[PDB]
Design a protein around this ligand. Structure first.
Ligand SMILES: C[S@@+](CC[C@H](N)C(=O)[O-])C[C@H]1O[C@@H](n2cnc3c(N)ncnc32)[C@H](O)[C@@H]1O
Length: 260
């Protein structure tokens, strides 16, 4: 058993009120009052982030932790926050965004955020069975939280195998992907294998809630995987009993309009 396993069991034990006080204490959080309202309407003229995923990818890019260039692929785009972020970047030539949709899953929000015309959105697609194609940048933000850590580990292992197939198709491609449950032994093993072949390492986003152990793997970064995960596990374990609340920051506004 690991520190992250204990955190998970610790987190499941929380009452509602303690879950609400724990999940956001000490985290950065975009103020989405306006963006939520634009989404609640049908507002198609919108450059504000369509989700909290946009700021996370921007945090990674702006730290030098993630490279976005050329033909981008967003695997599991949901509303498309990463897709719109990537499409706004001058180095990016095109985004091919895929998400499964269906009952209880988000579909792309259709909006005029800068560079939107460069995005090819495609719902009803299972990226785990899709054939990989050419890509310069491989993004994948897949990983649905679940009280059962074995399930989180299995979902995370499917993502890493997804990235192995896309990297086998595009060996020189950069990649950034969500690792929902990095503390699981099957996941540590798969990341270790991935790191031996493709390089990279794991980093923690300050926008991630304490309710999730998610870390992001990127080929732009380095580091001992086991140490990275334990460092995060210890921090999350510490945060219990603390309740200073989040630090609010403005949401990203990418502007609107087309790109060439
Ligand atoms: C949490 S969202 C990522 C958030 C997104 N990056 C954003 O900024 O809005 C991950 C998406 O992947 C989708 N997904 C899960 N499994 C999938 C699969 N097998 N094939 C395609 N999409 C999948 C989920 O429905 C979900 O909408």
């Amino acid at each position: 058993m690991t520190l992250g396993d204990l955190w998970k069991r610790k987190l499941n034990g929380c009452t509602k009120e303690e879950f609400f006080a724990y999940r956001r204490t000490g985290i950065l959080e975009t103020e989405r009052d306006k963006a939520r309202e634009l989404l609640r309407r049908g507002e198609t003229n919108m450059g504000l982030a369509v989700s909290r995923g946009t700021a996370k990818l921007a945090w990674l890019e702006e730290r030098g932790y993630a490279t976005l260039k050329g033909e981008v692929v967003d695997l599991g785009c949901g509303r498309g926050g990463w897709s719109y972020y990537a499409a706004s970047r001058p180095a990016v030539m095109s985004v091919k965004a895929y998400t499964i949709g269906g009952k209880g899953h988000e579909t792309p929000k259709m909006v005029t955020s800068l560079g939107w015309n460069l995005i090819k959105f495609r719902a009803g697609m299972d990226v785990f069975s899709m054939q990989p194609h050419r890509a310069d940048t491989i993004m994948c933000d897949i990983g649905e939280s679940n009280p059962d850590a074995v399930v989180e580990g299995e979902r995370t292992r499917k993502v890493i195998l997804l990235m192995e197939q896309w990297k086998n198709r595009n060996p020189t491609a950069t990649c950034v992907f969500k690792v929902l449950a990095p503390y699981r032994p099957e996941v540590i093993e798969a990341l270790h294998r991935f790191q031996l072949q493709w390089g990279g390492g794991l980093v923690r986003t300050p926008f991630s809630r304490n309710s999730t152990h998610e870390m992001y793997y990127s080929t732009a970064v380095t580091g001992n995987i086991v140490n990275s995960v334990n460092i995060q596990s210890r921090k999350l374990l510490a945060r219990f009993g603390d309740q200073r609340g989040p630090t609010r920051v403005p949401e990203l506004d990418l502007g609107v309009g087309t790109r060439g």
